[PDB]
Structures are given as C-alpha cells and as structure tokens.
C-alpha cells in the first residue's frame, strides 16, 4: 500500500551447492576477484592483523595513490567499492526530469541506480562484435542527459575501446554532461594503455572509476576510487555516507598499489588464460567468444545459459550465468590458473 | 561550466584518537562522542575476533535465523543492512523524490534530513517540545497526501527522550496506513524499565518498519550490521533495491554471537543507568544546567555556554565529546556514558565552568 517509486518495477552459499553435489574441491570462477589472490606483501599484512583492533577511521592512502598516478590529492575521491561510487553519482545527478545513456548489455549497476533515482534510461545495444556503439550513444545525448556511462573494458563482453576512440568521443560530448569511464578492469589490458589519468584535466566533465577488488585482489576490504577534476570531487564529497572503509582496508590498499610486480605477473598469466580460450573458440566454429581484455571470458555456446551453468557446476566449476547478464546462451567465466582454464575447456568441448 | 547537479544539493552541509592527542600532547584521551558502547563488546564476541585474522569475505542465513528466533519473528520480516545508515538511505531512495514530503522532528538524527534533501523531498521538520520530546501531535498535523515517510527516533538522538509504547501506538492509530512510519530504535536496548516487546507491532501496523543496530549497546565496531523489522510486503520491496555489498563473513559471525550474549547487555544497561544517575546528581546541584531525560547511553547537557567552547574545554582536558553545534543545540554537548570514573571526571570538569 506504500507509495513506492514507479520506476522501481523496472529493476526486479558456496559450501551449500558443494555438499548438495557430493563434490570435494569446488572451484569458483563467477566473480572477477583475482583468482591468484593478492601480493605476498599484502597477504602478510592480512595475516598480521586481528579483526579485534579493526575500525572505520586516510592521508596515507590519498597520498600514496596520488603519488602513484602523479596527480593532486584534490583529484581523488575514495569510496567503499566502486558500486558505492556508482550510487553516489546517480544521487547527485539523476532524477525524474533527467535521462542517462549507457550500453546494453553492460554492468547492471548503472541501470539499477539510474532507475532507482527515477531517471529515464537510454540503452544503446552493443555492436555485433560486442563494442559500445559510441556513435549511437552520442546521438542519444540530450539537454536533459546528465550522465553517460562507458564501461572500459566492458563487463560482461570484455571489449576494450582504444584511448584514441575514448578521446574522440569526449571531444564531441557536451561539456556539461558527466562521462563516467568505468575502468574496473583496466589493469588487465595488454598491451597496457598509456597513462590517461590526466585526461580529467583536459575534460572537466570526466570521472574515471577504479577499484582494488579485481586485479589487486582486495574485494575483502572494499576500496574504490574516482579520478576527476576538483570541481566534481568537491561536489561528490558533500554527499558521501558516515563511513566507508576500515583502517585495515586502507592499510592493505597502500601496499597493493606498491606491489606492481605482482600485477605484472597477473596481467601476464591472465593473458595466457585468455589465449587458452581463444585456441578453444578457434577449434569450434559454432562457439562465439567475445574479445577478452579483462580477467573473464564471455562464451556463447548456443546452449541455454542455465544448462551451461548447471553442467559446469555439477562438475565442480561455478561460473556466471549469461541469463543474468543479457546473454541467454552464454556464460561468463573468470580466467583462473591454467590447469583450471584447461578443465573448463575440456568440459565445454564435450558439449560441442 | 558545471555538471547539471540537482538543485536540492544546495541545502546540504558537508580519526580523532591519535592525531588530536598528539596535536595537543596529552598522555591519553577518552572518546565520549560516538555512542558506540564504551564498555566494548561481550567477551565471547571478543574471543572470536582475537581468533580471527583480517582475511574476510563479503557475503546471512545463520544470522537471520538467529535474529528471527531471538525475537520470535518470521525470517521474511527482516532485512539486514550494512549499518542502520544504509537502511535510512534505502528507505529514502524507494519513497522520496521532488514530488514528495517527509515529516520528522527537529533536532533529531541528522541523516533523516540529509537523505531526504538529496532525494529532493520537502522536509517538514517539527520542533521538539520544551522537555525535548517529539511533538507527535504537530507531526500528525503535518502529514499530507504527498507525505510518504514519517520518521520517529526513539529514544531520540540527540536529546535522549523516550516515548512510551502506549503513546507510540496512539500516534500510529492516527497515521494514514499509506504513509511509512520509520521507528528508529537504535538506542532501545538502554531503556529502563525495559519496554514491553513490540517487534510484532509490524503485524498490526503494516506501514511500520523498526530499525535496530549492533553498533551501540552490542558494541560491534569491527562489523557494521543493521536490520529492520517490518511486515513481509515492506521487506520484499526493500530487498529488490539493496546494494550487492552487505557485510563481512566475520561481521555476521560476530553478530550471531553478540545477540546471544544477553548477560553483557544486562550489565551494560544497568551500568549505563548508573552513569545517567551520576549526571542527574550533577544537574540537581546546578540549577543553571539543563540535562535532557536520557534513555540511551548519552546525556545532552545544556550549560548556557557555546557548544564550541565546551567542546574545546573538555578536549583539552582529555575528553572528546560531541558538540551541540553539529546537533542543533548551540549551547550543549552530548556526552556518551562511560565508566563510572570517567563520568566522574567529566562532571568535575563541567562544575569548574559553573
């Protein structure tokens, strides 16, 4: 009987399944947390801390991160995961009288938060190869458009848009429209893009979002951050919640950005995992492998997503079903260690 | 040229231990500003923490069973949230926008108003009574066809006033069954005499959600865990909109244990009640002082001196408090009830200003 927003209609455990199947080792490959874990140096901090001194308070982390990207601390905002930043963005800019532009299928959290704020969502279907249709998205932009979202690399497809095409897009976008460049996966791209944190100085309507929850392997403690010019950061500050991270989460992230050697080796093992899946798609014509540039692959088998999900799961691999992702006959599989990529590929092959 | 920020943001406003204590040079400092249990956590909760490394997963079955059982509720009448603050934000996001209004007392917990403004709602803020009580009647008068939420903080932050259950009910009887009433009971475990159980009122008043936390009496500082109690319809709806982030594996473990440990709750409640008695002995001696009827674990003391001065005076003498300037009382401090000797030290300092 309550008077809930009408825009609301439009949105609508590991040990569990394992004891239900009589399986020993079950391998989880459904979330894109780094399967290799963290640095040894970051691991030593975790093992060194008791959740008995833990609290929600950092100059340390602001400074460390600003020094890493050669930026001003004034250009950073920290948040308890990038999901939280997405929430904040929508609360400050979206409403009944506004619209927002994004791709489908992309990360569900944009449309979810946009719909909760009562915004009109204009969703531009990917190109057939899985790319953002940057052209259609520019055409959708309006005087009522307040936010354009670019997921780069894309989740769930993996596609990556080169900087030159990001810059071309930003030139044409009106300067009073915020463009959120979601770079949750950027550390996985090979070869690595050139430094473009500074882009935010050129385009005063740009925010880049990044997280410690993927490659850094700290989805545990939840640290995400936004890079944007001062004016944007200051506005975002006014509206953040009473607490974010624990002082330990912050301690862990300081060490994470320092251990680039771990990120190097991860970036390379991941690219090898991806090569594994490519050999597989090249063997089987009827399979559709989207272009992978993060730490997951999206594979359309022409088999119902739920069936693929159960089959892999009943053989001891949890993956992310495509029916949740906008792909009724695909699954998204996180790239893990080589010996696990191999076993999933062997299982898929029997289907084909 | 700026981004197209919503206009409702204009009317929005805007760690201590180690930095402040060195940025002064005191031996130690005592924090009596945040209302988290200064006596800490139960010893069993403690033992779990001390035997648990910082390795921790995000994502509630054992917890909702354990809490549903402790209150004799159905599990589907509960929603769990990363602190009561998230629930407050959740509520405002499902029910408030530019075309709505919400009613609340003033001064009350600042987050009700904050989140209302962001969502763009009109906030009809009803002044507290002289005694610090909610002007319940004034709040009935302020309800409209466009009102979607009424907020009731009980016991109130920052005044401490408690509204008796039979009064709650008499108000809820008048409220349109169309308007969500949020009864914020973050401090309810400090009230003596302890109130009748009233969790099951949500079965009578289908427009009622009650909100509680593990952040005050339960002392959970590691974990941030809040929950609401409402009828299944309200929960079902709130479930749709909840963030993917919720709370740690260990946070949930810790709360399962915290709620089973009711001996600690009993000792704290009586120890807290003794602390309040001390402040009452103090107000009785000084007719100049205005002490509010405290039923949570803090006192609001109006000394007729600027909030900022009281705050400095206490801080520089080892005691961090909450300035009434942040809380709507330019001439008070809100002081958390701690150990007996800490309460004594604070009363003695205040007396020298008097």
Curated annotation (Swiss-Prot), chain A:
Gene3D superfamilies: Aspartate Aminotransferase, domain 1 (3.90.1150.10), Type I PLP-dependent aspartate aminotransferase-like (Major domain) (3.40.640.10). The modification N6-(pyridoxal phosphate)lysine is found at residue 214. Its EC number is 2.6.1.9. One of its GO terms (biological process) is L-histidine biosynthetic process. The keyword Amino-acid biosynthesis applies. Its cofactor is pyridoxal 5'-phosphate. One of its GO terms (molecular function) is histidinol-phosphate transaminase activity. It holds the Pfam family Aminotran_1_2. Keywords: Amino-acid biosynthesis, Aminotransferase, Histidine biosynthesis, Pyridoxal phosphate, Transferase. Pathway: Amino-acid biosynthesis; L-histidine biosynthesis; L-histidine from 5-phospho-alpha-D-ribose 1-diphosphate: step 7/9. The keyword Amino-acid biosynthesis applies. It catalyses: L-histidinol phosphate + 2-oxoglutarate = 3-(imidazol-4-yl)-2-oxopropyl phosphate + L-glutamate. Homodimer. Belongs to the class-II pyridoxal-phosphate-dependent aminotransferase family. Histidinol-phosphate aminotransferase subfamily. This is Histidinol-phosphate aminotransferase. The gene is hisC.
């Amino acid at each position: 009987a309550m008077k809930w927003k009408k825009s609301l209609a439009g949105l609508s455990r590991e040990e569990e399944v394992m004891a239900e199947l009589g399986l020993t080792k079950i391998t989880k490959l459904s979330s894109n947390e780094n399967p290799l874990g963290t640095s040894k140096k970051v691991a030593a901090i975790q093992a060194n801390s008791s959740v008995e001194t833990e609290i929600y308070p950092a100059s340390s982390l602001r400074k460390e991160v600003a020094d890493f990207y050669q930026l001003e601390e004034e250009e950073l905002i920290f948040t308890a995961g990038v999901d939280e930043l997405i929430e904040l963005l929508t609360r400050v800019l979206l409403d009944t009288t506004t619209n927002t532009v994004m791709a489908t299928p992309t990360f569900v959290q944009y449309r979810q938060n946009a719909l909760i704020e009562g915004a009109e969502v204009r969703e531009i279907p990917l190109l057939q190869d899985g790319e953002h249709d940057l052209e259609g998205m520019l055409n959708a932009i309006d005087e009522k458009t307040t936010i354009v979202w670019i997921c780069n690399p894309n989740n769930p497809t993996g596609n990556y848009i080169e900087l030159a095409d990001i810059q071309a897009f930003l030139d044409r976008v009106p300067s009073d429209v915020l463009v959120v460049l979601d770079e949750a996966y950027i550390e996985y791209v090979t070869p690595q893009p050139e430094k473009h944190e500074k882009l935010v100085r050129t385009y005063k309507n740009l925010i880049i979002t990044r997280t410690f929850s993927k490659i850094y392997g700290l989805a545990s403690a939840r640290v995400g951050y936004g890079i944007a010019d001062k004016e944007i950061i200051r506005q975002l500050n006014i509206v953040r919640p009473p607490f974010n991270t624990t002082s330990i989460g912050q301690k862990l992230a300081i060490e994470a950005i320092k251990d680039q050697a771990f990120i190097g080796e991860c970036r390379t093992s991941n690219a090898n995992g991806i090569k594994q899946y490519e050999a597989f798609a090249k063997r089987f014509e009827k399979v559709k492998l989207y272009p992978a540039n993060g730490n997951f692959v999206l594979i359309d088998l022409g088999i119902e997503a739920g069936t693929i999900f159960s089959y892999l799961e009943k053989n001891g691999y949890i993956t992310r079903s495509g029916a949740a992702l906008g792909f009724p006959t695909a699954v998204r599989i996180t790239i893990g260690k080589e010996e696990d990529n191999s076993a999933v590929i062997a299982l898929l092959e029997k289907l084909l």
